[PDB]
């Protein structure tokens, strides 16, 4: 599957589409992108919308 990351705060607000395949892998990819850009913090995910949020 393809998963959407919403990054919300600090450095940037926006949505980046990563061809992340599965849930597990997308957490490891998304922790990296988040920490790469600054917004290390709390994680939420919703399945039905293919949606991951890095929230303050």
What CATH number does the domain containing 13 carry?
Answer: 3.10.20.10
Complete edge-to-edge strand list for the sheet that includes strand 51-55:
12-18, 3-9, 51-55, 42-46
DSSP 22: S
Contacts of residue 32, defined as CB under 8 A and 6 or more positions apart, other chains included, come to none
Cβ neighbourhood burial of 32 (10 Å; 0-12, 13-18, 19+): exposed
Tell me how many domains the chain contains. 1
Contacts of residue 28, defined as CB under 8 A and 6 or more positions apart, other chains included, come to none
54, 30 contact by CB (below 8 A): yes
Residue 10: which domain range? 1-56
């Amino acid at each position: 599957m393809q998963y959407k990351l919403i990054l919300n705060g600090k450095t940037l607000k926006g949505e980046t589409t990563t061809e992340a395949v599965d849930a597990a892998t997308a957490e490891k990819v998304f922790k990296q992108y988040a920490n790469d850009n600054g917004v290390d913090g709390e994680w939420t995910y919703d399945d039905a919308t293919k949606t991951f949020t890095v929230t303050e």
